[PDB]
Amino acid sequence: ELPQMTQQLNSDDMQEQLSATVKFRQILSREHRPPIDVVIQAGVVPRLVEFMRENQPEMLQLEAAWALTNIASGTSAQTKVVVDADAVPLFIQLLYTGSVEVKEQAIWALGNVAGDSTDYRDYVLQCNAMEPILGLFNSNKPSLIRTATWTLSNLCRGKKPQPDWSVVSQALPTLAKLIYSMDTETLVDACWAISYLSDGPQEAIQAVIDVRIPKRLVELLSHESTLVQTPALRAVGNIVTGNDLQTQVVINAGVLPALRLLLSSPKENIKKEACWTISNITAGNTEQIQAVIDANLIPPLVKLLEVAEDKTKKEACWAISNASSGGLQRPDIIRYLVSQGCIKPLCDLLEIADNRIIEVTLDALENILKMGEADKEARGLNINENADFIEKAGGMEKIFNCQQNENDKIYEKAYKIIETYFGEEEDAVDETMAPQNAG
């Protein structure tokens, strides 16, 4: 019964035009195997697009837009059809004019369109949707705010390329309020949108900080739902890729104790992101490395370095290694790391199959040795305590083998460690290793 419907939708009688649009909208709503393909191939999209113009009944506009939305929320190719019919600008102008039911349809449509790819995202923005979308967050209608937030986050999503910052940054003031919503889905989507916005240059991080977002985000790290934790954690982590002052705002908002909580999350990936986040704080200045230690984060970090999944261990190793940087100007830090038992896990990690981490791990071990060496030379002792700890943990053997690694920098640092801190007993090797090695 479809070629009939296609003709009833062409009738100049406004009465039949509606009846037809309504029948389309209904089959297009079937839960199981919607007939989106068949309806598209009957050529009726452009006809439905016309039914959304200003010069049309409020009741017809609704049904046409609802039908099209059902199409645009299908496959990437069925969304493409709706976009190629120039439906976006009419969806957009319906956000101003239309009633609330109509607004909710168009906002959902534009969300599905904006979420298909970075091109469609830019396209929605170029068609000046930002202005009307923001205007929706007055409605005090929970389901509409929920939807508008979902769409909003899709306009911010994507790093390569980033969206036009001068446009998407206009949403910061609204989001700043949205992360106070009591509707979980809203809250979640608002946090995603912030995680995307904060994921960029120092100018973007600063925008996030200047609307006072970071205070609230830190509070949200202890929300009961991991659906909130995740994006919130991520936004906070992105802020701390920034400079020392930026990082300091998040520490000042209470992020270290919240990170403590997350280092014992049931989800492995929350723990991984938490480690990453802490590692970017121990990459910070000496006060901040001390703040990390004062928040009792080292002990769980060390525990994860020994028993966590590999991806989590690498991130934890960064956190502990970055922290030993500050050990050359504050030797208390290294002493505390050592005493917390981080030597054996760092050593055991040298055999991981990742040269990026082996390097970081050797840098951490060198810093521990340099502090152990300056410790014994400062008080006329004849032994490097830290060197003996590394030796007794089978770390000497492991560092020794790193000289048989293909990366020249790894070999060179390992060679240096064996010569400097293990002098009489373990030879360093020079370059007859012309049959190279690694992978």
């Binding site: 979420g115 986050s153 999503r157 994507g158 790093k159 979640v188 989507d189 995603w192 995680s195 995307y196 994921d199 995740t230 994006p231 991520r234 982590g237 992105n238 701390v240 890729t241 920034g242 400079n243 020392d244 990082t247 989800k267 990936n269 992101e273 990453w276 590692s279 970017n280 704080i281 990459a283 910070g284 960064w318 970055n322």
Partner: peptide, 16 residues
């Protein structure tokens, strides 16, 4: 301070 994440991802639709 030091390191971007491996991928922005942590996107709502793709993550875990």
């Amino acid at each position: 301070m030091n390191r971007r994440k491996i991928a922005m991802p942590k996107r709502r639709m793709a993550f875990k």
